[PDB]
Amino acid sequence: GQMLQDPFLNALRKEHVPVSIYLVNGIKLQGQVESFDQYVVLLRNTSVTQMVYKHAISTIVPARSVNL
Amino acid sequence: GQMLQDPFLNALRKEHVPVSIYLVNGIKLQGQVESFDQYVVLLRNTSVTQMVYKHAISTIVPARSVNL
Amino acid sequence: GQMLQDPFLNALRKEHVPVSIYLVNGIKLQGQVESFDQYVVLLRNTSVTQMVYKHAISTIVPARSVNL
Amino acid sequence: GQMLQDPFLNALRKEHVPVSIYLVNGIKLQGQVESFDQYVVLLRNTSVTQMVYKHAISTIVPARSVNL
Amino acid sequence: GQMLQDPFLNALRKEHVPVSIYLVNGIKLQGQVESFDQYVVLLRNTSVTQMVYKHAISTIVPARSVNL
Amino acid sequence: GQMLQDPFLNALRKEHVPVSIYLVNGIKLQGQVESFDQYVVLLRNTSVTQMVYKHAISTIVPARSVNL
């Protein structure tokens, strides 16, 4: 397939779907996708928006499946 | 050889073959390949479709060998 | 989205916002973003400015959210 | 030197030489190289052909040295 | 910012500043930067000059801050 | 500096200098550099020539410093 990453991330963003982001260091982040670009995902929780490098993301697990 | 990754992934996709995806952080995911693009594999289980970054995948082990 | 990484880093830089940088090896660095370029972030604490490779950064957590 | 990776992999492939592939996550795979492309090696054992991402391979140790 | 990595490394080199290089595998190297190129840093201690791949470097901590 | 990686590797190769190659997974390999290309180093010991991916190498420590 082609050009699926961004539809996925935009669907999480627009639909405000809670996600679990599992990093290569074993940390698991939880929040909403606020925005993203070529290299980063901005992830918002109750406290803060943090900047996550995609290269460090293993998998993004949403609370529910999204339509792309 | 040349251009084998996508035939493999498409064969898993079309044939609905259960896979084990072993990530660089030691997590092992199980499900079916729903779709994929340059950078990601969308992996479906009973619960959810998650987005897996290829850069974090070490090996994809199918339940049976596939024809490319 | 597009071109968000640098606005984020520049906002941390200009606003002098303390950050926690979580590396792929589990080290957590704390300080202020002094500068950055394509590949590195220069992070200043009480003692020193160190050069952090972006490829080794998992997430940058600011003490407060920033305006991009 | 130049253009050695593929001669090595093709020699393992054509000669059917058993290999140990050591991944960045510490897993050690054993089998024969079935095929390979820019990004992946297809590794066959008694049970299955699995798809191994080169980016996750640290070293490929053959049971015997190969002629390139 | 732009083009900061090399000024940093050259300043360590020219000024002979002792550094701690923290690798993604947790090893910490100590010595002086002898030279560097696109991909590597040559690090000298009492015993030897070793070749360190930048892709494996998380952070370079100097004994004192440098002028770029 | 510029174009140092290959002079280093070729000097180890031509001079037959024993090396320790430290991989990102913590494995330490020992032998002589037999050859190398853009992506791999072929490392020979008493038993075998193995193919090491540069992306998995953290540092190459020679038994003695080499002239580039």
Swiss-Prot record, chains A, B, C, D, E, F:
Recorded superkingdom: Bacteria
Cellular compartments per GO CC: cytosol
Domain Sm: 6-66
Keywords, ordered alphabetically: RNA-binding, Stress response
GO BP annotations, alphabetical order: regulation of DNA-templated transcription; regulation of RNA stability; regulation of translation, ncRNA-mediated
Molecular function GO terms recorded: RNA binding
Role noted for this protein: RNA chaperone that binds small regulatory RNA (sRNAs) and mRNAs to facilitate mRNA translational regulation in response to envelope stress, environmental stress and changes in metabolite concentrations. Also binds with high specificity to tRNAs.
Similarity remark: Belongs to the Hfq family.
Subunit structure: Homohexamer.
Protein's name according to its UniProt entry: RNA-binding protein Hfq
Biological source species: Neisseria meningitidis serogroup C / serotype 2a (strain ATCC 700532 / DSM 15464 / FAM18)
Section of the entire sequence shown: 5 to 72 of 97
